[PDB]
Amino acid sequence: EVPKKKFTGRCRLFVGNLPNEVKETELKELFSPHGDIAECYLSGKGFAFLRLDTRAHAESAKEAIDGRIIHGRQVRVRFAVHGAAIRVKELSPTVSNEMLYHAFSHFGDVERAVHIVDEKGRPTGEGIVEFERKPNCNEAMAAIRDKVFLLTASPKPLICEVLEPRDEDDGLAERMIPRTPGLSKERELGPRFPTPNSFEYVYGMKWKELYVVEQKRRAQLDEELRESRRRLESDMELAYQDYQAQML
Amino acid sequence: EVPKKKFTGRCRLFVGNLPNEVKETELKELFSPHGDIAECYLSGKGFAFLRLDTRAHAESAKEAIDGRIIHGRQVRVRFAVHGAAIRVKELSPTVSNEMLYHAFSHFGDVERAVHIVDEKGRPTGEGIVEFERKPNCNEAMAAIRDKVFLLTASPKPLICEVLEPRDEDDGLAERMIPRTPGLSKERELGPRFPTPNSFEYVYGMKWKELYVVEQKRRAQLDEELRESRRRLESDMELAYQDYQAQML
């Protein structure tokens, strides 16, 4: 039903420190081994944009071309910021990828809609929505946040939030850490298991105790709220059954 | 400089419904357009395993070959389960990718170690550790869970958990949903904004109110625990300063 979309915002790469002699033909030549290209933009101001057909071809192009010396200039290849992505929550276990796609297709052209599942394949109640255009995304997000938006017969509304990107690929490189004396002080002692005859062990056991309390309180809160929901779900089922009985 | 490792567990593909006439050579031919190959295994029992050089080449191979008709059989390509991945928490904002790599390199050969950062590039306190071997991972996880393990001079211990993979790529396809009468009932009403003259609006407003309470309580709890930490951090700084003064 929903075809796999090509040259999306997730397939967009940014190219820094690019020689201005490098024209569109040479840029395509350089990225062509990785996949089909579209949306070539050359600024003439040392930077460029381009889209590969798939995120996988774009990751491969980034990994092979970032740091390469082109006509005497070290280029930088990075994924361009999407800026039109939503974190959907309170999704029903029956709301498919396709259901989520056409529902958000009301707000504008959608690139991808997915209902995330665990290792076991069970729905998580969380989903991702990516729009081709940023104001359409802002519209979808603002409307659903302000008013009750229902995907099914169920009165449970959707929650929409900005899908803040996380860097699990590059993370915190040693080079990015500002070098200070305090930093050298913390690296004087390295990876170790402290012993009870050491001063720091008593303080590390205090921290371990703290993490157990934190987890325990969070688990307690989740069970209070998870039960509050179970009572609401019950009251609603009983009232809806009663209402549908008087609507015959 | 920690080099980028090739033919990793994340690069490991599972190939299902393979006609047994397809030998190692035919499998190499078929996957070669996507990249270089290692760990080629052919069961002779309809399934297979192989490793592309990079996750990006392996995603590209999966996406191009999954569902393809080879010698009259519908093949199914998927990423094989890693099973040697850790979710590290309570990471210091100064523990880099490299620090995390060599620290866990004590437990065994590590494939990848990353301290995850936000869009802004700031450390999240969360990281990912992937080992070449599953027993080594189980060892690292069990030791750090049982005893206090310190990466820096700081008495704050590491938390290690099983990195349960999430399917953000395939998710919940409509086809995977068991078709029942209750499912047809929920899809009788589609994506909509209910109106105050509708019975369901009062129940959708009850749900919106509930989400505000949950968020409020969670934010209250986080601020109790966040303060508790600030008080512990203070008591420790004062005691460590006084201790280091008597250790001169």
Coordinates of N, CA, C and O in Angstrom, one line a residue, chain A residues 4 54 56-57 59-60 63 81 90 93-99 103 107 112 114-119 126 128 143-153 155-157 159 165-174 177 183 185-187 189-194 199-200 203-208 210-211 214 217-218 221-222 224-225 229 232-233 236 239-240 243, chain B residues 4 56-57 59-60 63 81 89-90 93-99 103 107 112 114-119 123-124 126 128 143-153 155-157 159 164-168 170-174 177 183 185-187 189-194 199-200 203-208 210-211 214 217-218 221 224-225 229 232-233 236 239-240 243:
Chain A
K4 N 8.0 2.9 -0.7 CA 9.3 3.3 -0.1 C 9.7 4.6 -0.9 O 10.0 4.5 -2.1
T54 N 18.6 6.6 -1.1 CA 18.3 5.9 0.2 C 19.3 6.4 1.3 O 20.4 6.8 1.0
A56 N 20.8 4.7 3.5 CA 21.9 3.7 3.5 C 23.0 4.1 2.4 O 24.2 4.0 2.7
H57 N 22.6 4.6 1.2 CA 23.5 5.1 0.2 C 24.2 6.4 0.6 O 25.3 6.7 0.2
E59 N 24.6 7.3 3.9 CA 25.5 7.0 5.0 C 26.9 6.5 4.4 O 27.9 7.0 4.9
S60 N 26.8 5.7 3.4 CA 27.9 5.1 2.7 C 28.7 6.3 2.0 O 30.0 6.2 2.0
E63 N 30.5 8.4 4.8 CA 31.6 7.6 5.4 C 32.8 7.5 4.4 O 33.9 7.4 4.9
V81 N 20.4 18.6 8.6 CA 19.3 18.5 9.6 C 18.0 18.4 8.9 O 17.7 19.3 8.0
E90 N 1.4 7.5 22.6 CA 0.0 7.1 22.9 C -0.6 6.4 21.7 O -1.9 6.5 21.6
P93 N -2.0 -0.2 19.9 CA -1.3 -1.3 19.4 C -1.7 -1.9 18.0 O -1.0 -2.8 17.5
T94 N -2.8 -1.3 17.5 CA -3.4 -1.6 16.2 C -3.3 -0.5 15.2 O -3.7 -0.6 14.0
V95 N -2.6 0.6 15.5 CA -2.4 1.7 14.6 C -1.1 1.3 13.8 O 0.0 1.3 14.3
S96 N -1.3 0.8 12.5 CA -0.2 0.5 11.7 C 0.6 1.7 11.2 O 0.2 2.8 11.4
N97 N 1.7 1.3 10.5 CA 2.6 2.3 9.8 C 1.8 3.0 8.7 O 1.9 4.3 8.6
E98 N 0.9 2.3 8.0 CA 0.1 2.8 6.9 C -1.0 3.7 7.4 O -1.3 4.8 6.8
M99 N -1.7 3.4 8.5 CA -2.7 4.2 9.2 C -2.1 5.5 9.7 O -2.7 6.6 9.4
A103 N -3.0 9.2 7.9 CA -3.6 10.1 9.0 C -2.8 11.5 9.0 O -3.4 12.5 8.9
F107 N -2.2 16.6 6.9 CA -1.4 17.8 7.2 C -0.4 18.2 6.1 O 0.0 19.3 6.1
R112 N 7.9 9.4 5.6 CA 7.9 8.2 6.3 C 7.1 8.4 7.6 O 7.1 9.4 8.3
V114 N 6.2 5.5 10.7 CA 6.5 4.2 11.3 C 6.0 4.1 12.7 O 6.2 5.0 13.5
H115 N 5.4 2.9 13.1 CA 5.0 2.6 14.5 C 6.1 1.7 14.9 O 6.2 0.6 14.5
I116 N 7.0 2.2 15.8 CA 8.2 1.4 16.3 C 7.7 0.2 17.1 O 6.7 0.2 17.9
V117 N 8.4 -0.9 16.9 CA 8.2 -2.2 17.6 C 9.5 -2.6 18.4 O 10.6 -2.2 18.0
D118 N 9.3 -3.5 19.4 CA 10.4 -4.0 20.2 C 11.1 -5.2 19.5 O 10.7 -5.4 18.3
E119 N 12.1 -5.9 20.1 CA 12.8 -7.0 19.5 C 11.8 -8.1 19.2 O 11.8 -8.7 18.1
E126 N 4.9 4.2 20.5 CA 5.6 5.3 20.0 C 5.8 5.1 18.5 O 6.0 4.0 18.0
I128 N 7.3 7.4 14.6 CA 8.0 8.5 13.9 C 7.3 8.9 12.7 O 6.9 8.1 11.9
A143 N -1.5 21.6 15.9 CA -2.9 21.2 15.9 C -3.3 20.1 16.9 O -4.2 20.3 17.7
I144 N -2.5 19.0 16.9 CA -2.6 17.8 17.7 C -2.3 18.1 19.2 O -2.8 17.4 20.1
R145 N -1.4 19.1 19.5 CA -1.0 19.5 20.8 C -2.1 20.3 21.4 O -2.4 20.2 22.6
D146 N -2.7 21.2 20.7 CA -3.8 22.2 21.0 C -5.2 21.5 21.2 O -5.8 21.8 22.2
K147 N -5.5 20.6 20.3 CA -6.8 19.9 20.3 C -6.7 18.4 20.3 O -5.6 17.9 20.1
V148 N -7.8 17.7 20.7 CA -7.8 16.2 20.8 C -7.9 15.6 19.4 O -8.8 15.9 18.6
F149 N -6.9 14.8 19.0 CA -6.9 14.2 17.7 C -6.9 12.7 17.9 O -6.0 12.1 18.6
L150 N -7.9 12.0 17.4 CA -8.2 10.6 17.5 C -8.0 9.8 16.2 O -8.6 10.3 15.2
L151 N -7.3 8.7 16.2 CA -7.0 7.9 15.0 C -8.0 6.8 14.8 O -8.2 6.3 13.7
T152 N -8.6 6.3 16.0 CA -9.6 5.2 16.0 C -10.8 5.6 16.8 O -10.9 6.8 17.2
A153 N -11.8 4.7 17.0 CA -13.0 4.9 17.8 C -12.7 5.2 19.2 O -13.6 5.8 19.9
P155 N -11.3 7.1 22.4 CA -11.1 8.5 22.8 C -9.7 8.9 23.3 O -9.5 10.1 23.6
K156 N -8.7 8.0 23.2 CA -7.3 8.3 23.6 C -6.6 9.1 22.6 O -6.4 8.7 21.5
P157 N -6.3 10.4 23.0 CA -5.7 11.3 22.0 C -4.2 11.0 21.7 O -3.5 10.4 22.5
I159 N -0.3 12.2 21.2 CA 0.7 13.2 21.7 C 1.7 13.3 20.6 O 2.1 12.3 20.0
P165 N 17.0 15.0 17.2 CA 17.9 13.9 16.8 C 19.0 13.6 17.8 O 19.5 14.5 18.4
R166 N 19.4 12.4 17.9 CA 20.4 11.9 18.8 C 21.6 11.3 17.9 O 21.3 10.5 17.0
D167 N 22.8 11.7 18.2 CA 24.0 11.3 17.5 C 24.6 10.0 18.2 O 25.4 10.1 19.1
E168 N 24.2 8.8 17.8 CA 24.6 7.5 18.2 C 25.7 7.0 17.3 O 26.2 5.9 17.5
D169 N 26.0 7.8 16.3 CA 27.0 7.4 15.3 C 28.3 8.0 15.5 O 29.3 7.2 15.5
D170 N 28.4 9.3 15.7 CA 29.7 10.0 16.0 C 30.0 10.3 17.4 O 31.1 10.3 17.8
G171 N 28.9 10.5 18.2 CA 28.9 10.8 19.6 C 29.9 11.9 20.1 O 30.0 12.9 19.5
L172 N 30.6 11.6 21.2 CA 31.6 12.5 21.9 C 33.1 12.0 21.6 O 33.6 11.3 22.3
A173 N 33.7 12.6 20.5 CA 35.0 12.3 20.2 C 35.9 13.0 21.2 O 35.6 14.1 21.6
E174 N 37.0 12.3 21.6 CA 38.0 12.8 22.5 C 38.4 14.2 22.2 O 38.5 15.1 23.0
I177 N 36.5 17.4 23.3 CA 36.5 17.7 24.7 C 37.4 18.8 25.0 O 38.6 18.7 24.7
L183 N 40.1 18.2 34.0 CA 40.0 17.1 33.1 C 41.2 16.1 33.3 O 41.0 14.9 33.4
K185 N 43.1 15.9 36.0 CA 42.9 15.4 37.3 C 42.0 14.2 37.4 O 42.3 13.2 38.0
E186 N 40.8 14.3 36.7 CA 39.9 13.1 36.6 C 40.4 11.9 35.9 O 40.0 10.8 36.1
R187 N 41.4 12.1 34.9 CA 42.0 11.0 34.2 C 43.3 10.5 34.8 O 44.0 9.6 34.2
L189 N 43.3 8.7 37.5 CA 42.8 7.4 38.0 C 41.9 6.9 36.8 O 41.2 7.7 36.2
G190 N 42.1 5.6 36.4 CA 41.4 5.1 35.2 C 40.4 4.0 35.6 O 40.0 3.9 36.7
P191 N 39.9 3.3 34.5 CA 38.8 2.3 34.8 C 39.3 1.3 35.8 O 40.3 0.6 35.7
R192 N 38.5 1.2 36.9 CA 38.8 0.3 38.0 C 37.6 -0.1 38.9 O 36.5 0.6 38.8
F193 N 37.7 -1.2 39.6 CA 36.7 -1.6 40.6 C 37.3 -1.2 42.0 O 38.3 -1.8 42.4
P194 N 36.8 -0.2 42.7 CA 37.4 0.2 44.0 C 37.2 -0.9 45.0 O 36.3 -1.7 45.0
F199 N 39.0 4.9 50.3 CA 38.1 6.0 50.7 C 36.9 6.1 49.7 O 35.8 6.3 50.2
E200 N 37.2 6.1 48.4 CA 36.2 6.3 47.4 C 35.0 5.2 47.3 O 34.0 5.4 46.7
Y203 N 31.8 6.1 48.9 CA 31.1 7.0 48.1 C 30.5 6.5 46.8 O 29.5 7.0 46.3
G204 N 31.1 5.4 46.3 CA 30.6 4.7 45.1 C 29.5 3.7 45.5 O 28.6 3.5 44.7
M205 N 29.4 3.3 46.8 CA 28.4 2.4 47.3 C 27.1 3.3 47.6 O 26.0 2.8 47.5
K206 N 27.4 4.6 47.9 CA 26.3 5.6 48.2 C 25.6 6.0 46.9 O 24.4 6.1 46.9
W207 N 26.4 6.0 45.8 CA 25.9 6.3 44.5 C 25.0 5.1 44.0 O 24.0 5.4 43.3
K208 N 25.5 3.9 44.2 CA 24.8 2.6 43.8 C 23.5 2.5 44.5 O 22.5 2.0 43.9
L210 N 21.7 5.1 45.7 CA 20.9 6.2 45.1 C 20.3 5.7 43.9 O 19.1 6.0 43.7
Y211 N 21.0 5.0 42.9 CA 20.4 4.5 41.7 C 19.3 3.5 41.9 O 18.3 3.5 41.1
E214 N 16.1 5.7 43.0 CA 15.7 6.3 41.8 C 14.8 5.5 40.9 O 13.7 5.8 40.6
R217 N 11.5 4.4 42.9 CA 10.5 5.5 43.0 C 9.9 5.6 41.6 O 8.7 5.7 41.5
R218 N 10.7 5.6 40.5 CA 10.2 5.6 39.1 C 9.2 4.5 38.8 O 8.1 4.7 38.3
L221 N 5.9 5.1 40.8 CA 5.2 6.2 40.1 C 4.5 5.5 38.9 O 3.3 5.7 38.8
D222 N 5.3 4.8 38.1 CA 4.7 4.2 36.9 C 3.6 3.3 37.2 O 2.6 3.2 36.5
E224 N 1.5 3.6 39.9 CA 0.4 4.4 40.4 C -0.4 4.9 39.1 O -1.6 4.7 39.0
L225 N 0.4 5.5 38.2 CA -0.2 6.1 36.9 C -0.7 5.0 36.0 O -1.8 5.2 35.4
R229 N -4.8 4.8 35.0 CA -5.2 4.6 33.6 C -6.2 3.4 33.5 O -7.2 3.5 32.8
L232 N -9.5 4.5 34.6 CA -10.1 5.4 33.6 C -10.7 4.5 32.5 O -11.8 4.7 32.1
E233 N -9.8 3.6 31.9 CA -10.2 2.7 30.8 C -11.4 1.9 31.1 O -12.3 1.7 30.2
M236 N -14.7 4.3 31.3 CA -15.0 4.7 29.9 C -15.7 3.5 29.2 O -16.7 3.8 28.6
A239 N -19.3 3.3 30.5 CA -20.1 4.4 30.1 C -20.4 4.4 28.6 O -21.5 4.6 28.2
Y240 N -19.4 3.9 27.8 CA -19.6 3.8 26.3 C -20.6 2.7 26.0 O -21.4 2.9 25.1
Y243 N -24.0 4.0 26.9 CA -24.3 5.0 25.9 C -24.8 4.4 24.6 O -25.8 4.7 24.1
Chain B
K4 N 37.7 2.5 12.6 CA 36.4 2.1 12.3 C 36.4 0.6 11.9 O 37.1 0.2 10.9
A56 N 25.9 0.3 6.6 CA 25.3 1.0 5.5 C 25.3 0.1 4.2 O 24.3 0.2 3.5
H57 N 26.3 -0.7 3.9 CA 26.4 -1.6 2.8 C 25.4 -2.8 3.0 O 24.9 -3.4 2.0
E59 N 22.6 -2.6 5.0 CA 21.2 -2.1 4.9 C 20.8 -2.0 3.4 O 19.7 -2.4 3.1
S60 N 21.7 -1.6 2.6 CA 21.6 -1.5 1.1 C 21.4 -2.8 0.5 O 20.5 -3.0 -0.4
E63 N 17.8 -4.1 1.7 CA 16.8 -3.4 1.0 C 16.6 -3.7 -0.4 O 15.5 -3.7 -1.0
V81 N 20.4 -10.9 14.6 CA 20.4 -10.3 16.0 C 21.8 -10.3 16.5 O 22.5 -11.3 16.5
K89 N 24.8 3.9 31.1 CA 24.2 5.0 31.7 C 25.1 5.6 32.8 O 26.1 4.9 33.1
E90 N 24.8 6.8 33.2 CA 25.6 7.6 34.2 C 27.0 7.9 33.8 O 27.9 8.0 34.6
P93 N 30.2 13.7 31.5 CA 30.2 14.4 30.3 C 31.6 14.5 29.6 O 31.7 15.0 28.4
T94 N 32.6 13.9 30.2 CA 34.0 13.9 29.8 C 34.5 12.5 29.4 O 35.7 12.3 29.0
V95 N 33.7 11.5 29.6 CA 34.1 10.2 29.2 C 33.8 10.2 27.6 O 32.6 10.2 27.2
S96 N 34.9 10.2 26.8 CA 34.7 10.1 25.4 C 34.5 8.7 24.9 O 34.6 7.7 25.6
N97 N 34.2 8.6 23.5 CA 34.0 7.4 22.8 C 35.2 6.4 23.0 O 35.0 5.3 23.2
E98 N 36.4 7.0 22.9 CA 37.7 6.3 23.0 C 37.9 5.8 24.4 O 38.4 4.7 24.5
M99 N 37.6 6.6 25.4 CA 37.7 6.2 26.9 C 36.8 5.0 27.2 O 37.3 4.1 27.8
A103 N 38.2 1.1 28.0 CA 37.7 0.7 29.3 C 37.0 -0.6 29.2 O 37.4 -1.5 30.0
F107 N 37.4 -6.2 29.1 CA 36.4 -7.4 29.1 C 36.5 -8.3 27.9 O 36.0 -9.4 28.0
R112 N 32.5 -1.5 18.7 CA 32.1 -0.1 18.8 C 31.7 0.3 20.2 O 31.0 -0.5 21.0
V114 N 30.4 4.1 21.8 CA 30.0 5.5 21.5 C 29.3 6.1 22.7 O 28.5 5.4 23.4
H115 N 29.6 7.4 23.1 CA 28.9 8.2 24.1 C 28.0 9.0 23.2 O 28.5 9.8 22.4
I116 N 26.7 8.7 23.2 CA 25.6 9.4 22.5 C 25.6 10.9 22.9 O 25.7 11.3 24.0
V117 N 25.4 11.8 21.8 CA 25.3 13.2 22.0 C 23.9 13.7 21.4 O 23.4 13.0 20.6
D118 N 23.5 14.9 21.8 CA 22.2 15.5 21.3 C 22.5 16.2 19.9 O 23.6 16.2 19.4
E119 N 21.5 16.9 19.3 CA 21.6 17.7 18.1 C 22.6 18.8 18.3 O 23.5 19.0 17.5
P123 N 27.1 15.7 25.4 CA 27.0 14.4 25.9 C 25.6 14.1 26.6 O 25.1 15.0 27.3
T124 N 25.0 13.0 26.4 CA 23.7 12.6 27.0 C 23.8 11.8 28.3 O 22.8 11.7 29.0
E126 N 24.5 8.8 28.3 CA 24.2 7.5 27.8 C 25.1 7.1 26.7 O 25.5 7.9 25.9
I128 N 26.6 3.4 24.1 CA 26.5 2.1 23.5 C 27.8 1.4 23.4 O 28.8 2.0 22.9
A143 N 29.6 -8.0 35.8 CA 30.6 -7.5 36.8 C 30.3 -6.0 37.3 O 30.3 -5.8 38.5
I144 N 29.9 -5.1 36.3 CA 29.6 -3.7 36.5 C 28.3 -3.5 37.2 O 28.1 -2.5 37.9
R145 N 27.3 -4.5 37.1 CA 26.0 -4.6 37.7 C 26.2 -5.0 39.2 O 25.6 -4.4 40.1
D146 N 27.1 -6.0 39.5 CA 27.4 -6.5 40.8 C 28.2 -5.7 41.7 O 28.0 -5.5 42.9
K147 N 29.3 -5.1 41.1 CA 30.3 -4.2 41.8 C 30.4 -2.8 41.2 O 29.9 -2.5 40.1
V148 N 31.0 -1.9 42.0 CA 31.1 -0.5 41.6 C 32.3 -0.4 40.6 O 33.4 -0.7 40.9
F149 N 32.0 0.1 39.4 CA 33.0 0.3 38.4 C 33.1 1.8 38.0 O 32.1 2.4 37.6
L150 N 34.3 2.4 38.2 CA 34.6 3.8 38.0 C 35.5 4.0 36.9 O 36.6 3.4 36.8
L151 N 35.1 4.9 36.0 CA 35.9 5.3 34.8 C 36.9 6.4 35.0 O 37.9 6.5 34.3
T152 N 36.5 7.3 36.0 CA 37.3 8.5 36.3 C 37.6 8.6 37.8 O 37.2 7.6 38.5
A153 N 38.2 9.7 38.3 CA 38.5 9.9 39.7 C 37.2 10.0 40.6 O 37.1 9.8 41.8
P155 N 33.6 9.1 42.1 CA 33.0 7.9 42.7 C 31.7 7.4 42.1 O 31.1 6.5 42.6
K156 N 31.2 8.1 41.1 CA 29.9 7.8 40.4 C 30.1 6.5 39.6 O 30.8 6.5 38.6
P157 N 29.4 5.4 40.0 CA 29.5 4.2 39.2 C 28.8 4.2 37.9 O 27.8 4.9 37.7
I159 N 26.3 2.3 35.0 CA 25.2 1.4 35.0 C 25.3 0.8 33.6 O 25.6 1.5 32.6
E164 N 18.3 -3.6 24.3 CA 17.2 -4.2 23.6 C 16.9 -3.4 22.3 O 16.7 -2.2 22.3
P165 N 17.1 -4.0 21.1 CA 17.0 -3.3 19.9 C 15.5 -2.9 19.5 O 14.6 -3.6 19.9
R166 N 15.4 -1.8 18.9 CA 14.0 -1.2 18.6 C 13.9 -1.2 17.0 O 14.9 -0.7 16.4
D167 N 12.8 -1.7 16.5 CA 12.6 -1.6 15.0 C 11.9 -0.3 14.6 O 10.6 -0.2 14.6
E168 N 12.7 0.7 14.2 CA 12.3 2.0 13.7 C 12.3 2.0 12.2 O 11.9 3.0 11.6
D170 N 11.2 -1.1 10.0 CA 10.1 -1.9 9.5 C 8.8 -1.7 10.3 O 7.7 -1.7 9.7
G171 N 8.9 -1.5 11.6 CA 7.8 -1.3 12.5 C 6.7 -2.2 12.5 O 6.9 -3.5 12.4
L172 N 5.4 -1.7 12.6 CA 4.2 -2.5 12.5 C 3.5 -2.4 11.2 O 2.6 -1.5 11.0
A173 N 3.7 -3.3 10.3 CA 3.1 -3.3 9.0 C 1.7 -3.8 9.2 O 1.4 -4.7 10.0
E174 N 0.7 -3.2 8.5 CA -0.7 -3.5 8.5 C -1.0 -5.0 8.4 O -1.7 -5.6 9.2
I177 N -0.9 -7.2 11.6 CA -2.0 -7.1 12.6 C -3.0 -8.2 12.5 O -3.5 -8.4 11.4
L183 N -11.1 -5.0 15.7 CA -10.2 -4.2 14.8 C -11.1 -3.5 13.7 O -10.8 -2.3 13.5
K185 N -14.2 -2.6 14.1 CA -15.0 -1.7 15.0 C -14.2 -0.5 15.3 O -14.8 0.6 15.1
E186 N -12.9 -0.6 15.6 CA -12.1 0.6 15.9 C -11.8 1.4 14.7 O -11.5 2.6 14.8
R187 N -11.8 0.8 13.5 CA -11.5 1.5 12.2 C -12.8 2.0 11.5 O -12.7 2.5 10.4
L189 N -14.5 4.6 12.6 CA -14.2 6.0 12.8 C -12.7 6.2 12.5 O -11.9 5.4 13.0
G190 N -12.4 7.2 11.7 CA -11.0 7.4 11.3 C -10.4 8.7 12.0 O -10.9 9.2 12.9
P191 N -9.2 9.1 11.4 CA -8.5 10.3 11.9 C -9.4 11.5 12.0 O -9.9 11.9 10.9
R192 N -9.6 12.1 13.2 CA -10.5 13.2 13.3 C -10.2 14.1 14.6 O -9.6 13.6 15.5
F193 N -10.7 15.3 14.6 CA -10.7 16.2 15.8 C -12.1 16.1 16.3 O -13.0 16.7 15.7
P194 N -12.4 15.5 17.5 CA -13.8 15.4 18.0 C -14.3 16.8 18.4 O -13.5 17.7 18.8
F199 N -20.2 12.9 22.2 CA -20.0 12.1 23.4 C -18.5 11.8 23.7 O -18.1 12.0 24.9
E200 N -17.7 11.4 22.7 CA -16.3 11.1 22.9 C -15.3 12.2 23.3 O -14.2 11.9 23.8
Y203 N -14.5 12.4 27.0 CA -13.6 11.3 27.3 C -12.1 11.6 26.7 O -11.2 11.1 27.3
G204 N -12.0 12.3 25.6 CA -10.7 12.7 25.0 C -10.1 13.8 25.8 O -8.9 14.0 25.9
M205 N -10.9 14.7 26.4 CA -10.5 15.8 27.3 C -10.0 15.2 28.7 O -9.1 15.8 29.3
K206 N -10.6 14.1 29.1 CA -10.2 13.4 30.3 C -8.9 12.7 30.2 O -8.1 12.8 31.1
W207 N -8.6 12.2 29.0 CA -7.3 11.7 28.6 C -6.2 12.7 28.5 O -5.1 12.4 29.0
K208 N -6.5 13.9 28.0 CA -5.6 15.0 27.9 C -5.2 15.6 29.2 O -4.0 16.0 29.5
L210 N -5.3 13.7 32.0 CA -4.5 12.6 32.6 C -3.0 12.8 32.2 O -2.2 12.6 33.0
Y211 N -2.8 13.0 30.9 CA -1.4 13.2 30.4 C -0.6 14.3 31.0 O 0.6 14.3 31.2
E214 N 0.3 13.0 34.7 CA 1.5 12.1 34.6 C 2.8 12.9 34.4 O 3.7 12.7 35.1
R217 N 3.7 14.9 37.6 CA 4.2 14.0 38.6 C 5.6 13.5 38.3 O 6.5 13.6 39.1
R218 N 5.9 13.1 37.0 CA 7.2 12.7 36.6 C 8.2 13.9 36.7 O 9.3 13.6 37.2
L221 N 9.0 14.2 40.5 CA 9.8 13.2 40.9 C 11.2 13.4 40.4 O 12.2 13.4 41.3
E224 N 12.9 16.0 42.6 CA 13.2 15.5 43.9 C 14.5 14.8 43.9 O 15.5 15.1 44.6
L225 N 14.6 13.8 43.0 CA 15.8 13.0 42.7 C 17.0 13.8 42.2 O 18.1 13.6 42.7
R229 N 20.6 14.3 44.4 CA 21.9 14.1 43.8 C 22.8 15.4 44.0 O 23.9 15.2 44.4
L232 N 24.1 15.2 47.5 CA 25.1 14.1 47.6 C 26.4 14.6 47.1 O 27.4 14.5 47.7
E233 N 26.3 15.2 45.8 CA 27.5 15.8 45.1 C 28.2 16.8 46.0 O 29.4 16.8 46.0
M236 N 29.9 15.0 49.2 CA 31.1 14.3 48.6 C 32.3 15.2 48.4 O 33.4 14.9 48.8
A239 N 33.7 16.4 51.7 CA 34.5 15.3 52.4 C 35.7 14.9 51.7 O 36.8 14.7 52.3
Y240 N 35.7 14.9 50.3 CA 36.9 14.6 49.5 C 38.0 15.7 49.7 O 39.2 15.4 49.8
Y243 N 39.4 15.3 53.1 CA 40.2 14.1 53.1 C 41.5 14.3 52.4 O 42.6 13.9 52.9

